[PDB]
Design an enzyme around this catalytic site. Structure first.
Site, PDB file in Angstrom:
ATOM      1  N   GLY A   1      43.776  24.278  48.531  1.00 13.57           N
ATOM      2  CA  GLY A   1      45.018  24.395  47.775  1.00 13.57           C
ATOM      3  C   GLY A   1      46.124  23.452  48.204  1.00 13.57           C
ATOM      4  O   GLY A   1      46.185  23.042  49.367  1.00 13.57           O
TER       5      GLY A   1
ATOM      6  N   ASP B   1      54.077  39.755  42.776  1.00 16.66           N
ATOM      7  CA  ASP B   1      53.380  38.676  42.071  1.00 16.66           C
ATOM      8  C   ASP B   1      51.914  38.997  41.771  1.00 16.66           C
ATOM      9  O   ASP B   1      51.028  38.168  41.991  1.00 16.66           O
ATOM     10  CB  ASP B   1      53.588  37.292  42.718  1.00 16.66           C
ATOM     11  CG  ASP B   1      53.441  36.137  41.727  1.00 16.66           C
ATOM     12  OD1 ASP B   1      53.509  36.386  40.508  1.00 16.66           O
ATOM     13  OD2 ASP B   1      53.276  34.989  42.174  1.00 16.66           O
TER      14      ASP B   1
ATOM     15  N   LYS C   1      48.832  39.263  39.575  1.00 14.05           N
ATOM     16  CA  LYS C   1      48.281  38.518  38.455  1.00 14.05           C
ATOM     17  C   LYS C   1      46.838  38.127  38.831  1.00 14.05           C
ATOM     18  O   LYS C   1      46.498  38.138  40.028  1.00 14.05           O
ATOM     19  CB  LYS C   1      49.154  37.282  38.112  1.00 14.05           C
ATOM     20  CG  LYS C   1      49.411  36.297  39.250  1.00 14.05           C
ATOM     21  CD  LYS C   1      50.260  35.143  38.750  1.00 14.05           C
ATOM     22  CE  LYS C   1      50.535  34.111  39.815  1.00 14.05           C
ATOM     23  NZ  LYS C   1      51.450  33.047  39.310  1.00 14.05           N
TER      24      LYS C   1
ATOM     25  N   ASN D   1      46.061  35.823  41.855  1.00 15.17           N
ATOM     26  CA  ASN D   1      46.290  36.434  43.166  1.00 15.17           C
ATOM     27  C   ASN D   1      45.347  37.592  43.476  1.00 15.17           C
ATOM     28  O   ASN D   1      45.639  38.415  44.350  1.00 15.17           O
ATOM     29  CB  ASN D   1      47.749  36.836  43.326  1.00 15.17           C
ATOM     30  CG  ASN D   1      48.669  35.659  43.450  1.00 15.17           C
ATOM     31  OD1 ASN D   1      48.262  34.549  43.801  1.00 15.17           O
ATOM     32  ND2 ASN D   1      49.936  35.878  43.187  1.00 15.17           N
TER      33      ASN D   1
ATOM     34  N   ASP E   1      48.073  36.403  48.514  1.00 12.21           N
ATOM     35  CA  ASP E   1      49.399  35.808  48.300  1.00 12.21           C
ATOM     36  C   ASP E   1      50.547  36.798  48.415  1.00 12.21           C
ATOM     37  O   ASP E   1      51.040  37.325  47.414  1.00 12.21           O
ATOM     38  CB  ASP E   1      49.472  34.998  46.989  1.00 12.21           C
ATOM     39  CG  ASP E   1      50.474  33.850  47.004  1.00 12.21           C
ATOM     40  OD1 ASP E   1      51.487  33.948  47.736  1.00 12.21           O
ATOM     41  OD2 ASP E   1      50.260  32.867  46.264  1.00 12.21           O
TER      42      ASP E   1
ATOM     43  N   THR F   1      55.858  36.108  37.744  1.00  9.39           N
ATOM     44  CA  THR F   1      55.224  35.232  36.760  1.00  9.39           C
ATOM     45  C   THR F   1      55.519  35.763  35.361  1.00  9.39           C
ATOM     46  O   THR F   1      55.377  36.961  35.122  1.00  9.39           O
ATOM     47  CB  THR F   1      53.728  35.099  37.064  1.00  9.39           C
ATOM     48  OG1 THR F   1      53.585  34.708  38.427  1.00  9.39           O
ATOM     49  CG2 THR F   1      53.024  34.081  36.159  1.00  9.39           C
TER      50      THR F   1
HETATM   51  N1  LIG Z   1      41.664  33.963  51.768  1.00 13.09           N
HETATM   52  C1  LIG Z   1      41.273  33.046  50.887  1.00 13.09           C
HETATM   53  N2  LIG Z   1      39.961  32.802  50.702  1.00 13.09           N
HETATM   54  C2  LIG Z   1      39.556  31.879  49.834  1.00 13.09           C
HETATM   55  N3  LIG Z   1      40.419  31.181  49.101  1.00 13.09           N
HETATM   56  C3  LIG Z   1      41.741  31.370  49.244  1.00 13.09           C
HETATM   57  C4  LIG Z   1      42.204  32.315  50.152  1.00 13.09           C
HETATM   58  N4  LIG Z   1      43.533  32.309  50.087  1.00 13.09           N
HETATM   59  C5  LIG Z   1      43.897  31.398  49.181  1.00 13.09           C
HETATM   60  N5  LIG Z   1      42.807  30.823  48.665  1.00 13.09           N
HETATM   61  C6  LIG Z   1      42.779  29.770  47.634  1.00 13.09           C
HETATM   62  O1  LIG Z   1      43.699  28.736  48.009  1.00 13.09           O
HETATM   63  C7  LIG Z   1      44.018  28.012  46.785  1.00 13.09           C
HETATM   64  C8  LIG Z   1      45.527  27.751  46.727  1.00 13.09           C
HETATM   65  O2  LIG Z   1      46.273  28.963  46.878  1.00 13.09           O
HETATM   66  P1  LIG Z   1      47.879  28.929  46.777  1.00 13.09           P
HETATM   67  O3  LIG Z   1      48.451  27.629  47.194  1.00 13.09           O
HETATM   68  O4  LIG Z   1      48.398  30.154  47.683  1.00 13.09           O
HETATM   69  O5  LIG Z   1      48.234  29.312  45.249  1.00 13.09           O
HETATM   70  P2  LIG Z   1      48.297  28.179  44.096  1.00 13.09           P
HETATM   71  O6  LIG Z   1      48.187  26.797  44.621  1.00 13.09           O
HETATM   72  O7  LIG Z   1      49.696  28.417  43.326  1.00 13.09           O
HETATM   73  N6  LIG Z   1      47.100  28.519  43.043  1.00 13.09           N
HETATM   74  P3  LIG Z   1      47.262  29.975  42.335  1.00 13.09           P
HETATM   75  O8  LIG Z   1      47.105  31.078  43.496  1.00 13.09           O
HETATM   76  O9  LIG Z   1      45.956  30.141  41.408  1.00 13.09           O
HETATM   77  O10 LIG Z   1      48.520  30.120  41.567  1.00 13.09           O
HETATM   78  C9  LIG Z   1      43.645  28.933  45.618  1.00 13.09           C
HETATM   79  O11 LIG Z   1      42.455  28.434  44.996  1.00 13.09           O
HETATM   80  C10 LIG Z   1      43.371  30.260  46.314  1.00 13.09           C
HETATM   81  O12 LIG Z   1      42.424  31.038  45.571  1.00 13.09           O
HETATM   82 MG   LIG Z   2      49.272  32.296  43.953  1.00 11.11          MG
END
Ligand SMILES: Nc1ncnc2c1ncn2[C@@H]1O[C@H](COP(=O)(O)OP(=O)(O)NP(=O)(O)O)[C@@H](O)[C@H]1O
Ligand SMILES: [Mg+2]
Ligand SMILES: [Ca+2]
Ligand SMILES: [Ca+2]
Ligand SMILES: [Ca+2]
Ligand SMILES: [Ca+2]
Length: 465
Positions: A32, A139, A141, A144, A160, A179
């Site tokens: 991410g 948040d 959704k 998350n 999250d 959101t």
């Molecule tokens: N514990 C976890 N295990 C696996 N993947 C994770 C974990 N925590 C976060 N992610 C992944 O990390 C990526 C980025 O998460 P994040 O930056 O927190 O939200 P984002 O970039 O706004 N995307 P989104 O959560 O869909 O709105 C996402 O694909 C999450 O699903």
């Molecule tokens: Mg998120």
């Protein structure tokens, strides 16, 4: 202090410490973009999700970590470790590989009533636990909500906690966060409580069944004006075959009046949830669980702390699968805690033997509560249950004993000292108690605990009577 004053909790394993990423983890790939990175533990080879947050203005993160360390529920994310550098904060999280619920919605497009109920009951269970611990997510959704694995019955994990908050029963929250599709109208009015999360789940359930949101539009402006009014409809062909029970639950969660809106706890008990989840369930029992639980009575606090760390932070999904399913079954109200009455009612799944109407069972439940309730809160919490019910062959594996010893041995010199013992739980205080806790398990009279002494103490605990 005496030993009877100490409390083994999953949160005690997380403390603000100095550390380097390269010292303990190897970078695999970017997950991410604030940055989520998939990393591999250089000792155990276990892969974890590390959230790197750049650097009081950093007080918001510390409050989030303070919330994250407490989180102990089958449907909520787990924090493995926390460390910091001169530039970044490192949140080491348990990795979930089943993707977001959002991904499943895009691929499946709509869920049947049974599938939607199974997912929503898990989100409600997680949220019931958060609200009972005075935490509001703000948040919720599909993005998350992560799936545990790519397996068929993989558990939902709430993730999250960046917008989360600790709420007070006497004060309303004012920060407009969330959101567009999911936000409660009272959040938009800057005066709300934890019921804002129930609204968000109602929007999610509507999407699961219909495949489209209840408040839509081409722009955020359009969506928010629809949210403000609180008007939505089931008058669309996607709703023709949807049961009255599913529509009744949505209506209660999307109740404009926060006071009359169903709580996460009450929604988990809704007749539609009960009917649909009974259809899915239409089941194993534990063997010699009561004898194993009784071993914890009066047990050494370092041994409790070790086993609690091994069971809560060192075990795989495959090892805890059956235990989590039994826990979820006994936990009738899905709040993530087993109370006295829940233990009494679900006793047949613990003992293995069937219970008759005719006292003895109540005495055994109080014995189990006395032994397994490590933090003395009156309940058998999720990690407490996993610790006391897990089979020895799986829990006492050499790699788990090694990692648990390595965690407590902060300087990594091969010995747990008096300073380190007070740090496993009480850092500033100097007491003969720490020295005496060690002397009781010290076999070479050096005033420290080596790996051999550590293992023997744990072996004495989980040994046969
Ligand atoms: N514990 C976890 N295990 C696996 N993947 C994770 C974990 N925590 C976060 N992610 C992944 O990390 C990526 C980025 O998460 P994040 O930056 O927190 O939200 P984002 O970039 O706004 N995307 P989104 O959560 O869909 O709105 C996402 O694909 C999450 O699903
Ligand atoms: Mg998120
Ligand atoms: Ca419960
Ligand atoms: Ca407890
Ligand atoms: Ca040491
Ligand atoms: Ca020694």
């Amino acid at each position: 202090y005496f030993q009877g004053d100490l409390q083994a909790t999953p949160g005690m394993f997380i403390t603000s410490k100095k550390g380097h990423l390269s010292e303990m983890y190897q970078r695999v790939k970017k997950l991410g973009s604030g940055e989520v990175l998939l990393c591999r533990d250089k000792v155990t080879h276990v892969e974890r999700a590390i959230k790197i947050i750049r650097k009081s203005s950093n007080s918001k993160l510390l409050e989030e970590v303070a919330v994250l360390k407490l989180l102990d529920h089958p449907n909520i994310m787990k924090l493995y470790d926390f460390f910091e550098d001169k530039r970044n904060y490192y949140l080491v999280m348990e990795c979930y590989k089943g993707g977001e619920l959002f991904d499943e919605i895009i691929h499946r497009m709509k869920f049947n009533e049974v599938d939607a109920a199974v997912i929503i009951k898990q989100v409600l269970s997680g949220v019931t636990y958060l609200h009972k611990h005075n935490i509001v997510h703000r948040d919720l959704k599909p993005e998350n909500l992560l799936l545990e694995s790519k397996e068929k019955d993989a558990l939902i994990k709430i993730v999250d906690f960046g917008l989360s908050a600790v709420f007070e029963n006497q004060k309303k929250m004012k920060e407009r966060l969330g959101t567009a599709y999911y936000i409660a109208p009272e959040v938009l009015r800057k005066k709300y409580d934890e019921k804002c999360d129930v609204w968000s789940i109602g929007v999610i359930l509507f999407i699961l069944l219909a495949g489209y949101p209840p408040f839509g539009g081409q722009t955020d402006q359009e969506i928010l004006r629809k949210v403000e009014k609180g008007k939505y409809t089931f008058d669309s062909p996607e709703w023709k075959n949807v049961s009255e029970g599913a529509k009744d639950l949505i209506k209660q969660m999307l109740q404009f009046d926060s006071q009359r809106r169903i709580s996460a706890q009450q929604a988990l008990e809704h007749p539609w949830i009960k009917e649909m989840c009974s259809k899915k369930e239409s089941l194993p029992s534990l063997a010699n669980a009561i004898e194993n639980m009784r071993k914890f009575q009066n047990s050494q606090k370092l041994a409790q702390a070790a086993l609690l760390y091994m069971a809560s932070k060192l075990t795989s999904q495959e090892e805890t699968k059956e235990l989590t399913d039994i826990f979820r079954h006994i936990d009738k109200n899905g709040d993530g805690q087993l109370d006295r009455q829940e233990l009494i009612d679900g006793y047949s799944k613990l003992s293995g033997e069937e219970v008759a109407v005719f006292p003895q069972i109540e005495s055994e439940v109080d014995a189990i509560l006395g032994a397994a309730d490590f933090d003395r809160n009156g309940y058998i919490d999720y990690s407490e249950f996993v610790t006391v019910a897990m089979d020895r062959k799986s829990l006492l594996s050499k790699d788990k004993l090694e990692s648990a010893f390595q965690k407590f041995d902060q300087d990594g010199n091969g010995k747990i000292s008096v300073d380190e013992l007070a740090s496993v739980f009480l850092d500033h205080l100097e007491s003969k108690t720490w020295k005496e806790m060690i002397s009781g398990i010290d076999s070479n009279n050096d005033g420290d605990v080596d790996f051999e002494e550590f293992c023997k103490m744990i072996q004495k605990l989980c040994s046969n009577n």
